[PDB]
Structure formats: C-alpha cells, structure tokens
Amino acid sequence: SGFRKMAFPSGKVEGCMVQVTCGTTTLNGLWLDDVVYCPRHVICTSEDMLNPNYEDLLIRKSNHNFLVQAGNVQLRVIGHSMQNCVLKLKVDTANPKTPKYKFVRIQPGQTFSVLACYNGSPSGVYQCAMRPNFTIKGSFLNGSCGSVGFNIDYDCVSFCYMHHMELPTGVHAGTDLEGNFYGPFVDRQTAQAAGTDTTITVNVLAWLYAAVINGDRWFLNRFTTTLNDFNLVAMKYNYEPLTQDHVDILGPLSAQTGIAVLDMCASLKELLQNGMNGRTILGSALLEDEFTPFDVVRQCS
Amino acid sequence: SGFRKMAFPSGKVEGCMVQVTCGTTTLNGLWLDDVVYCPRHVICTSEDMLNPNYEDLLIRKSNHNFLVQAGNVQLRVIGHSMQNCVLKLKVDTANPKTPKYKFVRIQPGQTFSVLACYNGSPSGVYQCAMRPNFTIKGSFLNGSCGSVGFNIDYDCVSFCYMHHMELPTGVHAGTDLEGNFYGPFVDRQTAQAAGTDTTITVNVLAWLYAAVINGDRWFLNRFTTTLNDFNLVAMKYNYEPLTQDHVDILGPLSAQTGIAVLDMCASLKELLQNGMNGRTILGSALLEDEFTPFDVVRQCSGVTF
Ligand SMILES: O=C(Nc1cncc2c1CNCC2)[C@@H]1CCOc2ccc(Cl)cc21
Ligand SMILES: O=C(Nc1cncc2c1CNCC2)[C@@H]1CCOc2ccc(Cl)cc21
Ligand SMILES: [Cl-]
C-alpha cells in the first residue's frame, strides 16, 4: 500500500555524468560509450546567446577547448560534432559504466526521472512529466544544464530529456538526446514564453484508479458520461482532451478496479465541479497529473 | 527555480542490494563489507509470525538455509547472528561496491530517501519523513521488506531505515540498521496500529521559506508572534511544538529571505486559522511537512554527492 511520486533508481545514470567546460562556461555532459553529449550552448558566452550562429562558433573550437572531467579524471576530447541542439564530444575512453541504453523522444503527459547535476556531480533525483505545453516543472539552478531525464523500465535506460533552459515563469525547456527541443523553444536568449498549460487528463484518471486500488472510493458516483460530454466539461477547467487512445490505455486499470473509464470520467467531472470538500485523495488536496497509467500499474503491482 | 520532492542519488545504495531467501520467503538484504543485513522475520513462516521465538527459530537454521543472490551471483553464507530485529548473514565475499557508510538512527521529522526493492533489485527511489508517530508513509508491496532508507552526507551513506512491516492503515514500520524499531512496533503478526500523527512544524516553516525563495509571498504578513503564542496555536492544530532549536536551525533561511522565523510563524498561524482561500503554495493546497530546513537549503543551493 501507499502511493508515492517515485523516481527510477539513478545509479545507472550517475555513472554517466561528467563535467564539460568550454571557456568560462561549465555544465553537465552525459558520457555513453566514447561520446559525451551536452547542450550545444556550452560554446556560447552570455553575449552570444541572443542570436548565436552555432555552426560558426563551433568551427572555431579545437578539441582541446573542451575540458571533460569524469570524477577526478580528465577525458581527452578527440572529435566533436553537433546534432541539432546537442554537442557530441568524442572522447578517447569509452565509459566503462555505460549501461544498456536507448534514446527515446517522449510525448506530452509522459513521465520520467530527472537526475539534477552540478559540475558533473549528481545532486538529487525527482520525478517529472512533460507538460502539454512541452515544458517540465523541474527544480534546476544555474549549472544544471546537461542534467538528463530518463526511464528505466527493465535494466535499459531510456534517455528522453537533456536540460537546456529555464523560461521566465520558472519552468524548464530541453531537448531529447538527438538535440531536438520539446516544444517551440530555441537555444537563444530571445524572448520566449511557456504557452498556457493544461492538466494531463489521462494521468489524473490513472491516479484516481490508483486511489481506488489503494482503498479510496469517496469520489465515485452513480453517473457515467459520453466521451464528448466529458471533453466539453474538461476543457472548461483547462484539462487536456481525452482521446479514444487514452480510454483504451486506461482499459487495464478499469478492468482491475471494475470501474469503467467513462464512469471514472464522471467522477472526475464531479471533482472538477465540487472540489474535494476538505477531503484528500492519496494524500493530496489537488488532482495529481504526473502519474501515467503505466506508472500506476508499475507502482501498484 | 522549481521545488520538487527530491531523493538523494541512489547509486551507492543500489550496489548494496541483494536478494535473501529462507525457505519460501524472499526479501531484500543490504550487503556491506562481508555482511548481509535483512529483517529477522525472513526466518518465519506465517504461523511463526503469530508469536515468534526468533532465537529458537534461528538455532534450527543452517548457513545453507540462507540463499543470498547479488545480481546473478550466489553469495556463500558462512555465519549468521541476530542483532535486535535484524539478521546479519556473514558472507565469504566483501561487497566490492561497499560505499563509505555509517548506521544512524534518525529522529521523527527527519527525511530520508527510500530505495524500494523487490527480489534484490531496486525498483524506485522516493523521499519521505519519519513521522512524529514513528511510521513512514511509504509505497511498499509484498517483497519490499529489507528495502532501506538513507541520506548522503558528503561522500558517506548514512543508512537509517530498513523496511519490515505495513500497518493496517497502509503506513509502514521498520528499524534502524541496528534492528531497533522506530516506534512501539514489534515484528509479530499481532494487532498493531499507527498512533495519532502530528504535522512536523519546523518542516512546514522550511517549506514556506522554500516557497518564498521560489517567488511565492502571498501568505506573508506584517505580523510577528512569540514562540509561546505560536506553540499554543500549533498545539491546537495537531502541529508538533516548535523549539528554540528549530528556530535556530531556520536561522539561515530567515536571513536569506529577510523573513524572521517568528514572522514566518505568524504566516503559518494565519494559514492554520484561515486556510489557503483557494490559493496554493509551491503547487500544493496542503502545508507540506516532508522537507527539512537542510533539504530546503540543499535543494535551493545545489549540493552534490
Ligand atoms: O536558462 C538558462 N539556464 C538555466 C538553466 N536552468 C535553470 C536556471 C537557468 C538560468 N538561471 C535560472 C535557473 C540559460 C541562461 C540564459 O538564458 C538561456 C537561454 C537559452 C538557453 Cl538554451 C539557456 C539559457
Ligand atoms: O507487514 C508485512 N509485510 C509487508 C511489507 N510491506 C508492505 C506490505 C506487506 C504486507 N502486505 C501488504 C503490503 C508482513 C506481513 C505479515 O504481517 C507482518 C507482521 C510483522 C512484520 Cl514485521 C511483517 C509482516
Ligand atoms: Cl511517450
């Protein structure tokens, strides 16, 4: 019993974190096999950040301009290339702690663990979700760039996020490990803003199923709803539309608890209307949206 | 910016988790140097649990009755002894991944990271606090016994918790690594219950300072209070008393934000007496008490391990 915001054990990723320095800028890199991945903005000064021409700035760098530190050992950079917004530094030593890994680009609503790092040293681990507006509500300070997000279903680390920037509202933007940003963000200090965010409906439903599995039923009701009427109500509270894919994904949890997906949608509609009336659900006074249906099944089973 | 419930990086602990089997029971063990630590109830059948005589049950076991698996490698048990509610299995191989470590017993209100494990394999990491009623609000399923809680102080892992039991309300009970239970619990299948819990006041104040550091100030007010008047309110709302030690510990956060501890107490007093009025603090509609003052400073200043 119990339901916590749970991160994957970070050990496999901790053994990949390195410090990357270029000039006066220091951030984190991810060392996998003989390559260190890091944000390409490590080659910029604060001045270069408004309209950097990364191809032009990079062509001027030599391998010895990149200082990579793995623990108390300097790694020798022997090549470099840019892939989208990520810099790939070829080093002369393969990371002996390289886990079984893959690069995966996630969709909004998906969750992952973040291993926040500073100076190539891990500081903490926490659980995030890719918001519908393509930002993450992380906890990152200056020096955290290059920290990564990942999942470890099985013993294979699926890297899905590399941290690049903090937006004015204090939320975070980054790329997948191929250097493609999530959302319409650019690695420039030009005016950028997070779009209006919405609640991840399918995840709230998953968390309500987690609450039912854990013995909480106070929010259930005798009603059901059509998917279209649910979406008309959902959107008035800034909830994401629930698609037939989301209804299908919730199938297993629905079968396990005996509560049809559209029956749980009717509970959610009532919670949006009424609030919790001084009650909590799984220790929360707000509807939680950073647990996916997959997370709920993994944690409760 | 941002403020998350953050656990310590678990790698140093992951390299210590092993699977311990005794008869039909499989649970987790902690392998440090040449010893595997695990709950002494691993030797009990469900019937033994009703009223166990652990010394009597243990004397009947041989070293070969304990099967210890570290990854895909079987460790050889060469001795066994009990220390309070923990079983210590001497193995013939020292764990080469043994980190710098200590065994520490924490106080209620202290937070720690839990590495939940099943079959000697780490499954997840989460942060929690030792409640004032000595339980933890964990997330544990069957097979999770022997999972451990820890903190990291510089390069040293301080192991503070080993999981043993789930109480009827779904909260958890365990021991320190010397096998002493936190709370008035016993490792026996007999009627036990979590006592009435209270809120960890010093931690709520620390989290209010974290909210201020992160740009949330709506709850601040022009008022201050005395420590005695604050404690009279805190007692009324099932909050733990705030001591001068707690006030001293909050000193740094008080100096950084410009909000004196008793000035923040006046904000808390008003929050208790009037609620949040539809507002949230750091994305929460409840006052969060599972961040210590040290956790707040560590997260808002970026300490690494
Ligand atoms: O945001 C950035 N880094 C950073 C990362 N995470 C947390 C925080 C910060 C900044 N200070 C608050 C906390 C840098 C700074 C300049 O502006 C840009 C613009 C574009 C890019 Cl790709 C990166 C950056
Ligand atoms: O509580 C126990 N273990 C367990 C551990 N964590 C989570 C869960 C469980 C049980 N099923 C729900 C989830 C065992 C079961 C029998 O009763 C006792 C009695 C005493 C002791 Cl020390 C241990 C136990
Ligand atoms: Cl995805």
Curated annotation (Swiss-Prot), chain A:
Peptidase C30 domain boundaries: 1-301
Cytoplasmic side: 1-301
Subunit structure: 3CL-PRO exists as monomer and homodimer. Only the homodimer shows catalytic activity. Interacts with host FBXO22; this interaction promotes the proteasomal degradation of nsp5.
Domain of life, per lineage: Viruses
Function: Cleaves the C-terminus of replicase polyprotein at 11 sites. Recognizes substrates containing the core sequence [ILMVF]-Q-|-[SGACN]. Cleaves and inactivates human TRMT1, preventing tRNA guanine(26)-dimethylation of tRNAs. May cleave human NLRP1 in lung epithelial cells, thereby activating the NLRP1 inflammasome pathway. May cleave human GSDMD, triggering alternative GSDME-mediated epithelial cell death upon activation of the NLRP1 inflammasome, which may enhance the release interleukins 1B, 6, 16 and 18. Also able to bind an ADP-ribose-1''-phosphate (ADRP).
Location in chain, cross-link Glycyl lysine isopeptide (Lys-Gly) (interchain with G-Cter in ubiquitin): K5, K90
UniProt protein name: 3C-like proteinase nsp5
Protein location: Host cytoplasm; Host Golgi apparatus; Host nucleus
Swiss-Prot/TrEMBL catalytic activity: TSAVLQ-|-SGFRK-NH2 and SGVTFQ-|-GKFKK the two peptides corresponding to the two self-cleavage sites of the SARS 3C-like proteinase are the two most reactive peptide substrates. The enzyme exhibits a strong preference for substrates containing Gln at P1 position and Leu at P2 position
Effect of M49A: Does not affect ability to cleave and inactivate human TRMT1
Active site: H41 (for 3cl-pro activity), C145 (nucleophile)
Activity regulation description: Inhibited by pyridone-containing alpha-ketoamides compounds 13a and 13b. In turn, alpha-ketoamide 13b (tert-butyl (1-((S)-1-(((S)-4-(benzylamino)-3,4-dioxo-1-((S)-2-oxopyrrolidin-3-yl)butan-2-yl)amino)-3-cyclopropyl-1-oxopropan-2-yl)-2-oxo-1,2-dihydropyridin-3-yl)carbamate) inhibits SARS-CoV-2 replication in human lung cells. Inhibited ex vivo by michael acceptor inhibitor N3. Inhibited ex vivo by compound 11a and 11b.
